Write a protein that binds this ligand. Structure first.
Ligand SMILES: [Mg+2]
Ligand SMILES: [Mg+2]
Ligand SMILES: [Mg+2]
Ligand SMILES: [Mg+2]
Ligand SMILES: [Mg+2]
Ligand SMILES: [Mg+2]
Ligand SMILES: [Mg+2]
Ligand SMILES: [Mg+2]
Ligand SMILES: [Mg+2]
Lengths: 145, 206, 58, 58, 143, 141, 70, 67, 63
RNA sequence: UUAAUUGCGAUAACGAACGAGACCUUAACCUACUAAAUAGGGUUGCUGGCACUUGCCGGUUGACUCUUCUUAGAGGGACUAUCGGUUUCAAGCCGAUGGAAGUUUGAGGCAAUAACAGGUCUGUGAUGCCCUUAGACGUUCUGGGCCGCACGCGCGCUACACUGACGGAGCCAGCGAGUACAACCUUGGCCGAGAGGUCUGGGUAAUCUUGUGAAACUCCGUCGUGCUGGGGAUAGAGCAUUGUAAUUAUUGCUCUUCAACGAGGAAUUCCUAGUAAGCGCAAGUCAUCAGCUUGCGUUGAUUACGUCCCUGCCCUUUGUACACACC
């Protein structure tokens, strides 16, 4: 029933993992701005941390943030089932992997390169600048972007 | 006067709103005067309705539209735009909200305000595209009361819709505002502005 | 035995049609006109109407 | 029983459809009797087109 | 004159039941809470997180009370909705069956829900009593 | 032995069978009391057979309605219709004619659908179109 | 974010001194005079509603209109 | 929309000619009479004919009519 | 500017080019026995009251 | 005049036929019949929960009876009826009133004379003639292709949000379809975040799937108008399923990625009432695949109830050097 006030004791407008995680946006829906952290995953992370979901990302104590960060890079440590990740069973090692922020893109690029090297159809398509997933293009996508 | 209960006991409010006055959503259809000679018989009121949702056979004959409660018509109008189309419950809800808003501000019967708005947004003289060959020149022409009513109903709804396009101001509030503007002839309302423009055009063409 | 009732009916019709076709094919010289099918107890009764009865009989 | 067919054999033309429908009448009657009597009843009163069917016994 | 669940505003009743469950602590949470979809055609887990599986359970119980015999598939059907299949029209998709099953099991453990002849599940007498009590409480609150 | 009659209400596809009995004054829809129904904005439609003629007639008549088919709105309408019918029917049977007539008048003056069941029914769809009348988009280039 | 809807204390204070003998007290209304919105305006209203003053007339989902005690 | 055909009107006229005594005024009676006398195949057609006859009768009780 | 209230006596045949106008004989309320005929947009009828802007003006067939 | 060469009429024509209409199927009404444990009720047994007085909601094919809802047989019912206007006081049209029904009562099925070098010889053991006829244009396997993309256009789907989005919760349909020589529809119980497995069933079906508790919707909450939690394209990886075979993702699911689009110019389609539009469901193909299709319900408007201005068609009067007919 009561509004939780705070004049400005908890400082707004923050940065987490290189880039911007801004205020007035919710604790979960500002983690989406970080590449690799989508929605459901973000929510899960938040739950693991134990943060109020009625909270702005602009607030948050540092310890909580640290905990969240910890959760992020290594989720198999925690109570996350780890079978909803990017690289589950993996391309190389055979481990549960979920890359984040500036790493996922790099990993993707690497994968693409590998594919190209192998000389599989998808790689060839990528090289060309075309549709991999059999979406036959007599029409559709006519601006090259 | 006299509350008597049954086996399945009914809430007190319902009991209160019964025999003496057939209230609308929760206030009287009585008072509420058509303050215009013409648009009588073409604005309904009179017959006391409870909800702005009847079954209705109003597009059947010719003037079956005129014997429909104005609230219902308004709701129908609101119902427009294809994404929203159908879903009359929503429209009804919106109407209710609007009514409540009206009640809150400047008091009165909201119904009365609505009636006033309807009266004061219906254009008196229109222009038809008559060329006498094919030229885009226009001719000054009188307006039917039904037509006046209908256009007025349309215009307010349109305005409301426009207001709603990217806004916190939930349609209902906007509608209420429009009504207020209309009843007390403002020129800040959209419908009224349109009407004025039409009038000007007519004057020019004459 | 053990087939859906509507389906069975359909099949019956189909069979009748087939029979008719067959008759048209064969009994053209005899001048075939119409078939009737009666599925009574024990025996199925096929009634043929043709212009040359004697020929049909053989 | 419903069927929908394009009236065309070839496909060219304004796309016009058929609604070939076959209506099935199914009706049942319940009797408490000795079986022989039932059989007697049902051995006669057979008309071509109508399927007579007996469940018999509980 | 007498109280039953059939005479109560439904949402309120459900809420009350959920509250009661919470108070109890007794149900058995399987531990899928804060991970799962509820319906396999959804964009999000629950927007309450801590609980609302209690709420779901309560709802299920209410449904059971209302009807005769209820199963898992049926429950799924009831609870699932329209999945946004992208640039393609929506379709009815059944809810997460396992969750429903778990809920049922929990209910059984509690002594609210009972395995019936023919197939499926009905209500226990204790469960019925509990429901009645809840209804009464709700009525009191309303008053 | 109790004075009772079986009147229905129909709208679109929905049917609501109301049993009107002698007794205390119950109005129940699918086992749940009249006070619920719960499209909520259309709750007053279901009240319209009660309050238009008054609760005075309801003191001795018990109404048990079973509603199936249609949607929600339609169902509600059907229920309302059934309620309207039932009292009238009872009057015709077990009370008196004048009273029944009065009731009818009360009903008839406010809304038509209460006694006369609605005429309208879905037009069948036909080929070359999405709906009954609306055709596909014809193109000449 | 184009502001008006944040948190603050001055704003809250202002809201509090905007309730007795008042016509309009909604969410939209609140937003209008450069104040809070969403599911904060409602809370603010309640904060005054709990201590008399503001009375509820309509309590629909994501639409609510309020009137002071007469 | 509703304009009666040859096969209604002519028939009605014929009926009137034959049976002006005993084909009187009100609808139901007229219909019954039609059913009795005329060998009308359909029901609807018969009904239509009866209606037409009634109309003709009505017209008659205000002066004579052509044909 | 003056405004008159005109009561319709006879519907005087649908005119215009597209039939979007109804010609109508109107005998106005506070000056009865004046039979000035005018062209009206919308669904009009006998006994209808029309709010117009020019009391003495004739509207001829819109061709 | 009419939806109509539909009629009233006028009249060197008179009486007719085909088409229209009639018809038939369907959709509406039936407290009037004939009926039911493959439909639904009533009381009443036993029985579960209640207040606790008799009363309220229940579970059971335990009895007995009923047919309002149900199905579907035989009937009936509307004929523009009754009245009021209006019109050679005609055909008719308009308005009340009663009624289930008053737009041909709603929707179709059928549909003339004469034709078109319209489309099919890729439906045919319908088919002329010509080709071909053992390195066959017969076939049959095997892989690929029909699906390729600088690009034009043609139906559509998804959307550009606040009349919303997402979460709960509430929670209502009608058409259907469904296997024994196969493998159909598949509840209910356990396992799995899913997809799915699995064991068991019930059903050749008003009996079981199925009350297809379908969506849109309604209730309370989280974001409040920022390419934002609008929107979902490409992508990356995994887990399933059908099939002998899934790369040229078959498809289903899981996390991640988050592109174009703030309602669309020149244009132009469809539509007048349970219609437009919204929303699912359903059979059709189908081993597997729905953005398609025939149906079906659910929610349900706005606006004419008119006119030849445009467009196409028809007729009348005219002109013609055209009659392969203005190409
Ligand atoms: Mg959407
Ligand atoms: Mg008359
Ligand atoms: Mg017809
Ligand atoms: Mg050709
Ligand atoms: Mg050949
Ligand atoms: Mg097409
Ligand atoms: Mg079924
Ligand atoms: Mg995004
Ligand atoms: Mg395919």
């Amino acid at each position: 029933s009561l509004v939780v006030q705070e004049q400005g004791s908890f400082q707004h407008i923050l940065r987490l993992l290189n880039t911007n995680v801004d205020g007035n946006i919710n604790v979960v829906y500002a983690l989406t701005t970080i590449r690799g952290v989508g929605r459901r995953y973000a929510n899960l992370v938040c739950k693991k941390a134990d943060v109020d979901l009625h909270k702005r990302a602009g607030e948050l104590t540092q310890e909580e943030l640290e905990r969240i960060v910890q959760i992020m890079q290594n989720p198999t440590h925690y109570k996350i089932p780890a079978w909803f990740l990017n690289r589950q069973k993996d391309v190389n090692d055979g481990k549960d992997y979920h890359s984040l922020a500036n790493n996922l893109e790099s990993k993707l690029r690497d994968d693409l390169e590998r594919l190209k090297k192998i000389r599989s159809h998808r790689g060839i398509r990528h090289f060309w600048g075309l549709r991999v997933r059999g979406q036959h293009t007599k029409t559709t996508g006519r601006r090259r972007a | 006067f006299v509350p008597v209960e049954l086996a399945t006991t009914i809430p007190v409010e319902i009991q209160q709103a019964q025999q003496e006055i057939k209230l609308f959503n929760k206030w009287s259809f009585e008072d509420v005067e058509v303050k215009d000679a013409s648009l009588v018989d073409y604005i309904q009121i009179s017959k006391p309705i409870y909800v702005a949702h009847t079954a209705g056979r109003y597009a059947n004959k010719r003037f079956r539209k005129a014997q429909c409660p104005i609230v219902e018509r308004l709701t129908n109008s609101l119902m427009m735009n294809g994404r929203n189309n159908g879903k009359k419950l929503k429209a009804v809800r919106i109407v209710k909200h609007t009514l409540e808003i009206i009640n809150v501000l400047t008091d009165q019967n909201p119904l009365q305000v609505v009636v006033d708005a309807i009266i004061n947004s219906g254009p008196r003289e229109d222009t038809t595209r008559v060329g006498g060959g094919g030229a885009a020149r226009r001719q000054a022409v009188d307006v039917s009361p039904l037509r006046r009513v209908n256009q007025s109903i349309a215009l307010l709804t349109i305005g409301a819709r426009e207001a709603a396009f990217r806004n916190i101001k939930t349609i209902a509030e906007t509608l209420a505002e429009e009504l207020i503007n209309a009843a007390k002839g403002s020129s800040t309302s959209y419908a009224i502005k349109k009407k004025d423009e039409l009038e000007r055009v007519a004057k020019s063409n004459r | 035995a053990i087939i859906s009732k509507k389906r069975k009916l359909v099949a019956d019709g189909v069979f009748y049609a087939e029979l008719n076709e067959f008759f048209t094919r064969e009994l053209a010289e005899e001048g075939y006109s119409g078939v009737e099918v009666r599925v009574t107890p024990t025996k199925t009764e096929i009634i043929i109407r043709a212009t040359k009865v004697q020929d049909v009989v053989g | 029983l419903k069927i929908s067919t394009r009236k065309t054999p070839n496909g060219e033309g304004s796309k016009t459809w058929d609604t070939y429908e076959m209506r099935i009448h199914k009706r049942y009657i319940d009797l408490e009797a000795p079986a022989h009597i039932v059989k007697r009843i049902t051995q006669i009163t057979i008309e071509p087109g109508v399927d007579v069917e007996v469940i018999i016994a509980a | 004159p007498g109280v039953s669940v059939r005479d109560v505003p439904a949402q309120d009743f459900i809420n009350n039941y959920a509250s009661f469950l919470q108070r109890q602590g007794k149900l058995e949470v399987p531990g899928y809470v804060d991970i799962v979809k509820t319906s396999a055609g959804n964009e999000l887990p629950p927007q309450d997180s801590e609980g609302w599986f209690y709420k779901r359970a309560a709802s299920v119980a209410r449904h059971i009370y209302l009807r005769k015999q209820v199963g898992v598939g049926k429950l799924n059907k009831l609870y699932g909705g329209a999945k946004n299949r992208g640039v393609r029209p929506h379709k009815h998709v059944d809810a997460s069956g396992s969750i429903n099953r778990k809920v049922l099991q929990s209910l059984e453990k509690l002594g609210v829900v009972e395995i019936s002849p023919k197939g499926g599940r009905r209500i226990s007498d204790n469960g019925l009593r509990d429901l009645d009590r809840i209804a009464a409480a709700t009525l009191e609150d309303e008053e | 032995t109790v004075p009772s009659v079986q009147t229905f209400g129909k709208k679109k596809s929905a049917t609501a069978v109301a049993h009107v009995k002698a007794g205390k004054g119950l109005i129940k829809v699918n086992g749940s009391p009249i006070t619920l129904v719960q499209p909520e904005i259309l709750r007053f439609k279901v009240y319209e057979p009660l309050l238009l003629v008054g609760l005075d007639k309801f003191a001795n008549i018990d109404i048990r309605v079973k509603v199936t088919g249609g949607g929600h709105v339609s169902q509600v309408y059907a229920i309302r219709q059934a309620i309207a019918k039932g009292l009238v029917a009872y009057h015709q049977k077990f009370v008196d004619e004048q009273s029944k007539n009065e009731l009818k008048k009360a009903f008839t003056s406010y809304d038509r659908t209460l006694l006369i069941a609605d005429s309208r029914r879905p037009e069948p769809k036909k080929f070359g179109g999405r709906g009954a009348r609306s055709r596909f988009q014809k193109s000449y280039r | 974010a184009k502001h008006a809807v944040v948190l603050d204390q001055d704003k809250f204070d202002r809201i509090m001194k905007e309730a007795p003998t008042y016509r309009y007290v909604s969410v939209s209304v609140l937003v209008d005079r450069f104040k809070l919105g969403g599911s904060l305006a409602r809370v603010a209203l309640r904060h005054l509603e709990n201590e008399g003053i503001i009375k509820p007339v309509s309590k629909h989902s994501k639409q609510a209109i309020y009137t002071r005690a007469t | 929309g509703r304009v009666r055909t040859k096969t209604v009107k002519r028939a009605s006229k014929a009926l009137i000619e034959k049976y002006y005594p005993k084909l009187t005024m009100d609808f139901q009676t007229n219909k019954r009479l039609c059913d009795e006398i005329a060998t009308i195949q359909s029901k609807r057609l018969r009904n239509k004919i009866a209606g037409y006859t009634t109309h003709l009768m009505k017209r008659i009780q205000k002066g004579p009519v052509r044909g | 500017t003056p405004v008159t209230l005109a009561k319709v006596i006879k519907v005087l045949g649908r005119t215009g080019s597209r039939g979007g106008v109804t010609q109508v004989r109107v005998e106005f309320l506070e000056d009865t026995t004046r039979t000035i005929v005018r062209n009206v947009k919308g669904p009009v009828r006998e006994g209808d009251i029309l709010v117009l802007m020019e009391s003495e003006r004739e509207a001829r067939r819109l061709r």
